[PDB]
CSV table of C-alpha atoms in Angstrom, one decimal:
chain,number,residue,atom,x,y,z
A,22,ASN,CA,108.2,84.5,152.7
A,23,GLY,CA,108.6,87.8,150.9
A,24,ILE,CA,110.5,86.1,148.0
A,25,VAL,CA,108.6,83.2,146.2
A,26,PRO,CA,110.4,81.7,143.3
A,27,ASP,CA,108.8,80.6,140.1
A,28,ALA,CA,108.1,76.9,139.9
A,29,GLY,CA,109.9,76.4,136.7
A,30,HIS,CA,113.6,76.1,135.6
A,31,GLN,CA,114.5,79.8,136.4
A,32,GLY,CA,113.1,79.7,140.0
A,33,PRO,CA,116.0,79.8,142.4
A,34,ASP,CA,116.1,77.9,145.7
A,35,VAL,CA,114.9,80.3,148.5
A,36,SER,CA,115.1,79.7,152.2
A,37,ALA,CA,115.6,81.5,155.5
A,38,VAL,CA,118.2,81.4,158.3
A,39,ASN,CA,117.2,82.0,161.9
A,40,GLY,CA,116.1,85.6,162.3
A,41,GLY,CA,114.2,85.7,159.0
A,42,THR,CA,117.0,86.7,156.6
A,43,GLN,CA,116.2,85.2,153.2
A,44,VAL,CA,118.9,83.3,151.3
A,45,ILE,CA,118.6,82.9,147.5
A,46,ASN,CA,120.7,80.1,145.8
A,47,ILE,CA,120.5,81.8,142.4
A,48,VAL,CA,120.1,79.7,139.3
A,49,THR,CA,123.0,78.5,137.2
A,50,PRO,CA,124.4,81.4,135.0
A,51,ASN,CA,124.2,81.1,131.2
A,52,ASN,CA,127.3,81.4,129.1
A,53,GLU,CA,127.1,85.2,129.2
A,54,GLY,CA,127.4,85.0,133.0
A,55,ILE,CA,123.7,86.0,133.6
A,56,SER,CA,121.8,84.2,136.4
A,57,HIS,CA,118.2,84.8,135.3
A,58,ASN,CA,116.0,84.3,138.3
A,59,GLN,CA,112.1,84.4,138.0
A,60,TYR,CA,109.7,85.0,140.9
A,61,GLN,CA,106.1,85.0,141.7
A,62,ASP,CA,106.8,87.5,144.6
A,63,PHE,CA,109.9,89.4,145.4
A,64,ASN,CA,110.0,91.5,148.6
A,65,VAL,CA,112.7,92.1,151.1
A,66,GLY,CA,112.1,93.0,154.8
A,67,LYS,CA,114.1,94.4,157.6
A,68,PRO,CA,116.0,91.0,158.0
A,69,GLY,CA,117.3,91.5,154.5
A,70,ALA,CA,118.2,88.9,151.8
A,71,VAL,CA,121.4,87.3,150.6
A,72,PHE,CA,122.1,86.1,147.1
A,73,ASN,CA,124.6,83.2,147.1
A,74,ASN,CA,127.1,83.9,144.4
A,75,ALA,CA,130.0,82.0,146.1
A,76,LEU,CA,132.3,79.4,144.7
A,77,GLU,CA,133.7,78.6,148.2
A,78,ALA,CA,132.2,78.6,151.6
A,79,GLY,CA,132.6,81.7,153.8
A,80,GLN,CA,131.0,84.4,156.0
A,81,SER,CA,128.1,86.4,154.7
A,82,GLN,CA,127.4,89.8,156.3
A,83,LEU,CA,123.6,89.1,156.8
A,84,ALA,CA,123.1,85.4,157.0
A,85,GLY,CA,126.3,83.9,158.7
A,86,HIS,CA,128.3,81.1,157.2
A,87,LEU,CA,127.2,79.7,153.9
A,88,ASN,CA,128.5,76.9,151.6
A,89,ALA,CA,129.2,77.7,147.9
A,90,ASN,CA,126.1,77.8,145.8
A,91,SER,CA,126.0,74.4,144.2
A,92,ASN,CA,123.9,75.7,141.4
A,93,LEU,CA,126.9,77.7,140.0
A,94,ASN,CA,128.6,74.6,138.8
A,95,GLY,CA,132.0,76.6,139.4
A,96,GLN,CA,131.2,79.9,137.5
A,97,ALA,CA,129.9,82.8,139.4
A,98,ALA,CA,127.2,85.1,137.9
A,99,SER,CA,128.4,88.5,136.4
A,100,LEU,CA,124.8,89.6,136.5
A,101,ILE,CA,122.0,88.6,138.9
A,102,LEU,CA,118.8,89.3,137.1
A,103,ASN,CA,115.7,89.0,139.3
A,104,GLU,CA,112.5,89.1,137.3
A,105,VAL,CA,109.0,89.2,138.8
A,106,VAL,CA,106.7,87.4,136.3
A,107,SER,CA,103.4,87.8,138.2
A,108,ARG,CA,101.2,90.9,138.8
A,109,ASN,CA,102.6,91.5,142.3
A,110,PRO,CA,104.5,94.7,142.9
A,111,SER,CA,107.8,94.6,145.1
A,112,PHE,CA,108.6,96.2,148.4
A,113,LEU,CA,112.3,96.5,149.4
A,114,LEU,CA,112.5,97.4,153.1
A,115,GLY,CA,116.0,96.1,154.0
A,116,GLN,CA,119.4,95.2,152.7
A,117,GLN,CA,120.3,92.9,149.8
A,118,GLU,CA,123.7,91.4,149.8
A,119,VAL,CA,125.6,89.5,147.2
A,120,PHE,CA,127.6,86.8,149.0
A,121,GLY,CA,130.8,85.7,147.3
A,122,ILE,CA,131.8,87.3,144.0
A,123,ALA,CA,130.7,90.8,143.5
A,124,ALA,CA,128.1,91.1,140.6
A,125,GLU,CA,125.8,93.5,139.0
A,126,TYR,CA,122.2,93.3,140.3
A,127,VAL,CA,118.9,93.9,138.5
A,128,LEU,CA,115.3,93.7,139.9
A,129,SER,CA,112.7,94.0,137.2
A,130,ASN,CA,109.0,94.3,138.2
A,131,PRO,CA,106.7,96.0,135.7
A,132,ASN,CA,104.0,96.2,138.4
A,133,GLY,CA,106.0,98.7,140.5
A,134,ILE,CA,108.9,98.7,143.0
A,135,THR,CA,109.0,100.5,146.3
A,136,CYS,CA,112.2,101.1,148.3
A,137,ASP,CA,112.1,102.4,151.8
A,138,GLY,CA,115.4,101.9,153.7
A,139,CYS,CA,116.7,99.4,151.2
A,140,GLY,CA,120.2,98.9,150.1
A,141,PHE,CA,122.8,96.9,148.3
A,142,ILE,CA,126.0,95.2,149.5
A,143,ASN,CA,128.7,93.8,147.3
A,144,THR,CA,127.1,94.9,144.1
A,145,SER,CA,129.1,96.8,141.4
A,146,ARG,CA,125.9,98.2,140.0
A,147,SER,CA,122.3,97.8,141.2
A,148,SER,CA,119.4,98.6,138.9
A,149,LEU,CA,115.7,98.8,139.8
A,150,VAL,CA,113.5,98.5,136.6
A,151,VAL,CA,109.8,99.0,136.6
A,152,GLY,CA,109.6,97.2,133.3
A,153,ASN,CA,110.5,93.9,131.7
A,154,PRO,CA,113.7,92.3,130.4
A,155,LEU,CA,113.8,91.6,126.7
A,156,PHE,CA,115.3,88.3,125.4
A,157,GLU,CA,115.9,87.2,121.9
A,158,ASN,CA,117.2,83.7,121.0
A,159,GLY,CA,117.9,83.1,124.8
A,160,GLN,CA,120.2,86.1,125.3
A,161,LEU,CA,119.3,89.2,127.3
A,162,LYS,CA,118.9,92.1,124.9
A,163,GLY,CA,117.9,94.9,127.3
A,164,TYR,CA,114.7,96.2,129.0
A,165,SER,CA,111.5,97.9,128.3
A,166,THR,CA,109.2,100.4,130.0
A,167,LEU,CA,107.0,100.7,126.9
A,168,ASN,CA,103.2,100.9,127.6
A,169,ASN,CA,103.8,101.0,131.3
A,170,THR,CA,102.6,103.7,133.6
A,171,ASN,CA,103.7,102.2,137.0
A,172,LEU,CA,105.9,103.8,139.6
A,173,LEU,CA,109.3,103.3,141.2
A,174,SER,CA,108.8,104.8,144.7
A,175,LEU,CA,111.6,105.6,147.1
A,176,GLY,CA,110.4,106.3,150.6
A,177,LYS,CA,111.5,108.5,153.5
A,178,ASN,CA,114.1,106.0,154.7
A,179,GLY,CA,115.9,106.1,151.3
A,180,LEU,CA,118.3,103.8,149.5
A,181,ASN,CA,122.0,103.2,150.1
A,182,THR,CA,124.8,101.6,148.1
A,183,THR,CA,128.5,102.0,147.7
A,184,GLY,CA,128.1,101.0,144.1
A,185,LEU,CA,126.5,102.5,140.9
A,186,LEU,CA,122.7,102.8,141.0
A,187,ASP,CA,120.2,102.9,138.1
A,188,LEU,CA,116.5,103.8,138.6
A,189,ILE,CA,114.5,102.9,135.5
A,190,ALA,CA,110.7,103.5,135.3
A,191,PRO,CA,107.9,105.2,133.6
A,192,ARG,CA,107.9,107.6,136.6
A,193,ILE,CA,109.8,107.9,139.8
A,194,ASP,CA,108.6,109.4,143.1
A,195,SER,CA,111.4,109.7,145.7
A,196,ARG,CA,111.1,111.2,149.2
A,197,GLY,CA,114.3,110.2,151.0
A,198,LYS,CA,118.0,110.2,150.8
A,199,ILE,CA,119.5,108.3,147.9
A,200,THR,CA,123.2,107.4,148.5
A,201,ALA,CA,125.2,105.8,145.7
A,202,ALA,CA,128.6,106.1,143.8
A,203,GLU,CA,126.6,107.5,140.8
A,204,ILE,CA,122.9,107.8,140.3
A,205,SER,CA,121.3,107.4,136.8
A,206,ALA,CA,117.5,107.8,136.5
A,207,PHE,CA,115.8,107.2,133.3
A,208,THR,CA,112.1,108.0,133.1
A,209,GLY,CA,109.5,107.6,130.5
A,210,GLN,CA,108.4,104.9,128.1
A,211,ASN,CA,111.5,103.5,126.6
A,212,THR,CA,113.5,100.5,125.4
A,213,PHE,CA,117.0,100.1,126.6
A,214,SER,CA,120.1,98.0,125.8
A,215,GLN,CA,121.5,95.6,128.5
A,216,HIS,CA,123.6,98.6,129.6
A,217,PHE,CA,120.7,101.1,129.7
A,218,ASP,CA,121.4,102.9,126.5
A,219,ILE,CA,118.1,104.4,125.4
A,220,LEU,CA,117.2,102.7,122.1
A,221,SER,CA,113.6,104.0,121.5
A,222,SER,CA,111.0,106.1,123.3
A,223,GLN,CA,107.2,106.6,122.9
A,224,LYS,CA,105.0,109.5,124.1
A,225,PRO,CA,102.7,108.3,126.9
A,226,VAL,CA,98.9,108.5,126.4
A,227,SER,CA,98.9,110.9,129.4
A,228,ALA,CA,101.6,112.6,131.4
A,229,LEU,CA,104.1,110.6,133.4
A,230,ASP,CA,105.4,113.0,136.0
A,231,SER,CA,108.4,112.3,138.3
A,232,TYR,CA,109.2,113.8,141.6
A,233,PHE,CA,112.4,114.0,143.6
A,234,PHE,CA,112.1,115.3,147.1
A,235,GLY,CA,114.7,114.6,149.7
A,236,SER,CA,118.3,114.4,148.7
A,237,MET,CA,120.9,112.8,146.6
A,238,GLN,CA,124.3,112.0,148.1
A,239,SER,CA,126.4,111.1,145.0
A,240,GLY,CA,129.1,112.7,143.1
A,241,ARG,CA,127.4,112.1,139.8
A,242,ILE,CA,123.7,112.4,139.1
A,243,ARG,CA,122.0,112.0,135.7
A,244,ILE,CA,118.3,112.2,135.1
A,245,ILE,CA,117.1,111.4,131.5
A,246,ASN,CA,113.4,111.9,130.8
A,247,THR,CA,112.0,111.1,127.4
A,248,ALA,CA,108.2,111.8,128.0
A,249,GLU,CA,108.0,114.8,125.9
A,250,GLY,CA,106.2,117.4,127.9
A,251,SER,CA,106.2,115.5,131.3
A,252,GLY,CA,108.4,117.1,133.9
A,253,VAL,CA,111.0,116.5,136.7
A,254,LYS,CA,109.9,118.1,139.9
A,255,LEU,CA,112.3,119.0,142.7
B,19,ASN,CA,122.7,151.2,133.2
B,20,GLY,CA,122.7,147.7,134.6
B,21,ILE,CA,125.7,146.9,132.4
B,22,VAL,CA,128.9,149.0,132.9
B,23,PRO,CA,131.9,148.1,130.8
B,24,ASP,CA,135.5,148.1,132.1
B,25,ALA,CA,137.3,151.3,131.0
B,26,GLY,CA,140.1,149.3,129.3
B,27,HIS,CA,140.7,147.4,126.1
B,28,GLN,CA,138.3,144.6,126.9
B,29,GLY,CA,135.4,146.9,127.8
B,30,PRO,CA,132.7,146.7,125.1
B,31,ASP,CA,130.6,149.6,123.9
B,32,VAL,CA,127.3,149.6,125.7
B,33,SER,CA,124.2,151.6,125.0
B,34,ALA,CA,120.5,151.5,125.2
B,35,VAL,CA,117.6,151.8,122.6
B,36,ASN,CA,114.3,153.3,123.4
B,37,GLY,CA,112.5,151.3,126.1
B,38,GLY,CA,115.7,150.6,128.0
B,39,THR,CA,116.9,147.5,126.2
B,40,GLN,CA,120.7,147.3,126.5
B,41,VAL,CA,122.9,146.8,123.4
B,42,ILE,CA,126.4,145.5,123.8
B,43,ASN,CA,128.8,145.9,120.9
B,44,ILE,CA,131.1,143.2,122.0
B,45,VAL,CA,134.9,143.5,121.7
B,46,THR,CA,136.8,142.1,118.7
B,47,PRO,CA,137.3,138.3,119.0
B,48,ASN,CA,140.7,136.9,119.3
B,49,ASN,CA,142.0,134.3,116.9
B,50,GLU,CA,140.3,131.5,118.7
B,51,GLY,CA,137.0,133.4,118.2
B,52,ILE,CA,136.6,134.4,121.8
B,53,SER,CA,135.2,137.9,122.5
B,54,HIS,CA,136.4,138.5,126.0
B,55,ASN,CA,134.3,141.4,127.5
B,56,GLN,CA,135.1,142.8,130.9
B,57,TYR,CA,132.7,144.7,133.2
B,58,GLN,CA,132.5,146.7,136.3
B,59,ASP,CA,128.8,145.8,136.6
B,60,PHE,CA,126.7,143.2,134.7
B,61,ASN,CA,123.0,143.2,135.3
B,62,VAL,CA,120.0,142.6,133.0
B,63,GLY,CA,116.5,144.0,133.7
B,64,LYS,CA,113.1,143.2,132.2
B,65,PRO,CA,114.0,145.2,129.0
B,66,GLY,CA,116.7,142.6,128.3
B,67,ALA,CA,120.0,143.0,126.6
B,68,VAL,CA,121.3,142.2,123.1
B,69,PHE,CA,124.9,141.2,122.2
B,70,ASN,CA,125.7,142.4,118.7
B,71,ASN,CA,127.5,139.5,117.0
B,72,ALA,CA,126.4,140.4,113.5
B,73,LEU,CA,128.5,140.8,110.3
B,74,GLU,CA,125.5,142.4,108.5
B,75,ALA,CA,122.6,144.7,109.4
B,76,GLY,CA,119.3,143.1,110.4
B,77,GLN,CA,116.4,142.7,112.8
B,78,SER,CA,117.1,141.8,116.4
B,79,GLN,CA,114.3,140.4,118.5
B,80,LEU,CA,114.6,142.7,121.5
B,81,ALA,CA,116.3,145.9,120.1
B,82,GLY,CA,115.0,146.4,116.6
B,83,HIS,CA,117.1,147.0,113.6
B,84,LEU,CA,120.9,147.1,114.1
B,85,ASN,CA,124.0,147.6,112.0
B,86,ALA,CA,126.7,145.0,112.0
B,87,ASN,CA,129.1,145.3,114.9
B,88,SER,CA,132.1,147.3,113.6
B,89,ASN,CA,134.3,145.8,116.3
B,90,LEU,CA,134.2,142.4,114.7
B,91,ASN,CA,136.3,143.4,111.8
B,92,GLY,CA,134.5,140.8,109.8
B,93,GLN,CA,134.7,137.6,112.0
B,94,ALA,CA,131.9,136.9,114.5
B,95,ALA,CA,132.6,135.5,117.9
B,96,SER,CA,132.3,131.8,118.6
B,97,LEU,CA,132.3,132.5,122.3
B,98,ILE,CA,131.0,135.7,124.0
B,99,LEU,CA,132.8,135.6,127.4
B,100,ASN,CA,131.4,138.2,129.8
B,101,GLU,CA,133.6,138.7,132.9
B,102,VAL,CA,132.8,140.8,135.9
B,103,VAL,CA,136.0,142.1,137.3
B,104,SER,CA,134.8,144.1,140.2
B,105,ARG,CA,133.2,143.0,143.6
B,106,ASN,CA,129.6,143.5,142.3
B,107,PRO,CA,127.3,140.5,142.0
B,108,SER,CA,125.1,140.1,139.0
B,109,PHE,CA,121.3,140.0,138.6
B,110,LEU,CA,119.7,138.7,135.5
B,111,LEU,CA,115.9,139.6,135.3
B,112,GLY,CA,115.3,139.4,131.6
B,113,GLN,CA,116.3,137.9,128.3
B,114,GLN,CA,119.8,138.0,126.7
B,115,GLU,CA,119.9,137.8,122.9
B,116,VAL,CA,122.8,137.1,120.6
B,117,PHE,CA,122.0,139.2,117.5
B,118,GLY,CA,123.6,137.8,114.3
B,119,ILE,CA,125.7,134.7,114.4
B,120,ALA,CA,124.7,132.2,117.0
B,121,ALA,CA,127.5,131.8,119.6
B,122,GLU,CA,128.2,130.2,123.0
B,123,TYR,CA,127.7,132.6,125.9
B,124,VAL,CA,129.5,132.7,129.4
B,125,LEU,CA,128.9,135.1,132.3
B,126,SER,CA,131.5,134.8,134.9
B,127,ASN,CA,131.1,136.6,138.3
B,128,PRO,CA,132.9,135.3,141.3
B,129,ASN,CA,130.7,137.5,143.5
B,130,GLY,CA,127.5,135.7,142.8
B,131,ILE,CA,124.9,135.5,140.0
B,132,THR,CA,121.1,135.6,140.5
B,133,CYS,CA,118.7,134.6,137.7
B,134,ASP,CA,115.0,135.3,138.1
B,135,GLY,CA,113.1,135.1,134.9
B,136,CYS,CA,116.2,135.3,132.8
B,137,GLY,CA,116.7,133.6,129.5
B,138,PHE,CA,118.9,133.2,126.4
B,139,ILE,CA,118.1,133.7,122.7
B,140,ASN,CA,120.3,132.5,119.8
B,141,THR,CA,122.9,130.9,122.1
B,142,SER,CA,124.1,127.3,121.3
B,143,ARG,CA,125.3,127.0,124.9
B,144,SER,CA,124.9,129.4,127.9
B,145,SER,CA,127.0,129.0,131.0
B,146,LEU,CA,126.7,130.9,134.3
B,147,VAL,CA,129.9,130.7,136.3
B,148,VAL,CA,130.3,132.0,139.9
B,149,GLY,CA,134.0,131.9,139.5
B,150,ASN,CA,136.7,133.3,137.3
B,151,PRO,CA,138.1,132.5,133.9
B,152,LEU,CA,141.7,131.3,133.7
B,153,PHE,CA,144.0,132.6,131.0
B,154,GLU,CA,147.6,131.6,130.2
B,155,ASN,CA,149.7,133.3,127.6
B,156,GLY,CA,146.6,135.2,126.4
B,157,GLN,CA,144.5,132.1,125.7
B,158,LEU,CA,141.4,131.0,127.7
B,159,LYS,CA,142.3,127.8,129.6
B,160,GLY,CA,139.2,127.3,131.6
B,161,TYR,CA,137.5,128.4,134.8
B,162,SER,CA,137.9,128.3,138.6
B,163,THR,CA,135.5,128.1,141.6
B,164,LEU,CA,138.5,127.4,143.9
B,165,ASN,CA,138.3,129.3,147.3
B,166,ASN,CA,135.0,130.7,146.6
B,167,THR,CA,131.8,130.1,148.6
B,168,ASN,CA,129.4,132.3,146.7
B,169,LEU,CA,126.0,131.4,145.3
B,170,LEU,CA,124.3,130.9,141.9
B,171,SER,CA,120.7,131.6,142.8
B,172,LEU,CA,117.8,130.9,140.5
B,173,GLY,CA,114.5,132.5,141.5
B,174,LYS,CA,110.9,131.6,141.3
B,175,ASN,CA,110.5,132.9,137.7
B,176,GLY,CA,113.2,130.5,136.5
B,177,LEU,CA,115.4,130.4,133.5
B,178,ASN,CA,114.7,129.5,129.9
B,179,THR,CA,116.7,128.6,126.9
B,180,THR,CA,116.3,126.4,123.8
B,181,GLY,CA,120.1,125.7,123.9
B,182,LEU,CA,122.4,123.9,126.4
B,183,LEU,CA,122.8,125.3,129.8
B,184,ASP,CA,125.7,125.0,132.3
B,185,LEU,CA,125.4,126.1,135.9
B,186,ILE,CA,128.9,126.3,137.6
B,187,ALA,CA,129.3,127.5,141.2
B,188,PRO,CA,130.4,126.7,144.6
B,189,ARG,CA,126.8,126.2,145.5
B,190,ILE,CA,123.5,126.6,143.7
B,191,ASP,CA,120.1,127.4,145.1
B,192,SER,CA,117.3,127.1,142.6
B,193,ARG,CA,113.6,127.8,143.3
B,194,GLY,CA,111.9,127.9,139.9
B,195,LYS,CA,111.6,126.2,136.6
B,196,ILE,CA,114.8,125.7,134.6
B,197,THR,CA,114.0,125.0,130.9
B,198,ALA,CA,116.9,124.0,128.6
B,199,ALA,CA,117.9,121.5,126.0
B,200,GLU,CA,120.3,120.0,128.5
B,201,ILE,CA,121.1,121.1,132.0
B,202,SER,CA,124.6,120.5,133.5
B,203,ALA,CA,125.2,121.7,137.0
B,204,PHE,CA,128.7,121.4,138.6
B,205,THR,CA,129.1,122.4,142.3
B,206,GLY,CA,132.0,122.6,144.6
B,207,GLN,CA,135.4,124.2,144.5
B,208,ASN,CA,136.9,123.1,141.2
B,209,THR,CA,139.0,124.0,138.2
B,210,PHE,CA,137.6,123.4,134.8
B,211,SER,CA,138.7,123.2,131.2
B,212,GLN,CA,137.2,125.5,128.5
B,213,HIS,CA,134.6,122.9,128.0
B,214,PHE,CA,133.8,122.4,131.7
B,215,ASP,CA,135.7,119.2,132.2
B,216,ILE,CA,136.6,119.0,135.9
B,217,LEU,CA,140.3,119.2,136.2
B,218,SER,CA,140.8,119.4,140.0
B,219,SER,CA,138.8,119.8,143.2
B,220,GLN,CA,139.3,120.9,146.7
B,221,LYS,CA,137.5,120.2,150.0
B,222,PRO,CA,135.8,123.4,151.2
B,223,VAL,CA,136.7,124.7,154.7
B,224,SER,CA,133.0,124.3,155.5
B,225,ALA,CA,130.0,122.7,153.8
B,226,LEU,CA,128.8,124.0,150.5
B,227,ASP,CA,125.3,122.8,150.2
B,228,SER,CA,123.1,123.1,147.0
B,229,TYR,CA,119.3,123.1,146.8
B,230,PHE,CA,117.1,122.4,143.8
B,231,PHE,CA,113.5,123.2,144.4
B,232,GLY,CA,111.0,123.8,141.6
B,233,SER,CA,111.5,121.8,138.5
B,234,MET,CA,113.7,121.0,135.5
B,235,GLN,CA,112.2,120.8,132.1
B,236,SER,CA,115.0,119.2,130.2
B,237,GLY,CA,115.5,115.8,128.5
B,238,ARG,CA,119.1,115.5,130.0
B,239,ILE,CA,120.1,116.7,133.5
B,240,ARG,CA,123.5,116.1,135.1
B,241,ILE,CA,124.5,117.3,138.5
B,242,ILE,CA,128.2,116.8,139.6
B,243,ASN,CA,129.1,117.7,143.1
B,244,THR,CA,132.7,117.5,144.2
B,245,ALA,CA,132.4,118.8,147.7
B,246,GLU,CA,133.0,115.6,149.6
B,247,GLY,CA,130.3,115.4,152.2
B,248,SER,CA,128.2,118.3,151.0
B,249,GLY,CA,124.9,117.3,149.6
B,250,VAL,CA,122.3,118.0,146.8
B,251,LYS,CA,118.9,118.7,148.3
B,252,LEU,CA,115.7,118.3,146.3
């Protein structure tokens, strides 16, 4: 029970198959294609987790055979946005798979996110955001790390994906191998568009220092730090 | 005598002022604005070096009062390209200043470049290239690190500039603080345009691994590695 959905309209259906792998029947996407899922707790263990973004039955890598997700009503998500709405931080200790149609993935948790041996399957882009999504008039407008000093931590067992990776947080502390098609890390207290264009920045009350130990196995790495003064240590 | 010009038409006039600071009266720019300077040896010590890109007399930061560079014939360089044509590697242990009109700066040395406490004054962009410039029909076409396995080393005393910085080499080993408006590092065996667009890449015969210790004090960092397999260690 690492993943606990919110009790309201944006809480997805969450269950487990034998062996403990979590299966999330994501909520119906809006007209922009965004499935906005809210959680009281979001954690993934070694058994992993599967997001059902399928319009037809078939074979998932981590959870066996699954039906189509009835919640989709015939249109798959373009973006699976997972938002933790409580004060609980997230720990990602295994693989997350999008079953069915490949999608963009976001986990937002302003309380902190820790990856250690996590990874992403069948995602075009995966973004970890220690911050909150911003909505206006029911549409996703972007994200915010303003007034937040919490950490995106990546542990010794690293993070792997064949897709694009975004790491968005007030500060990042990475100690393992990050493997991705491209890595984009954006640190500081910022607001962002839906596509992680930086729209504004503010100077933190005290330093927000980020640390990258370990390695990065990617053909394209970008690190953008807006906290004037604060550093990027390697 | 850290800097020794080539004896031919692209060798600039090199001298020293009291205290040992080197002064380079760069060669006449071509119609594109490129002053292409060739050297048998190019090294900078603690006293530093000043490139005279001035159309009028005035005060340099490192070498006192200087006349205009008569070699310019009334048009300053847009790019000061310094090319080592021998087998000697380069050591940069102090500041390099463009006196007069701010310009882009390039040092190319396919034998290796080591920075340790080096820096750049009055440059819009400074690029260190462990590789060769490419010319066709007398015009600069870009740069090459093909078939080269040599190192761009940055030592414990680091590198500072208020301008843009490019680090171009088969491999980079950095152990100090790099301070720049933006840092772009491109590793592997590549060809480049004049503006460091990657045009081609080849897989090295054996691994070309790069290492970034220390820190990077810059709002925008990009690291592009084309050596398929080889890593970026932090």
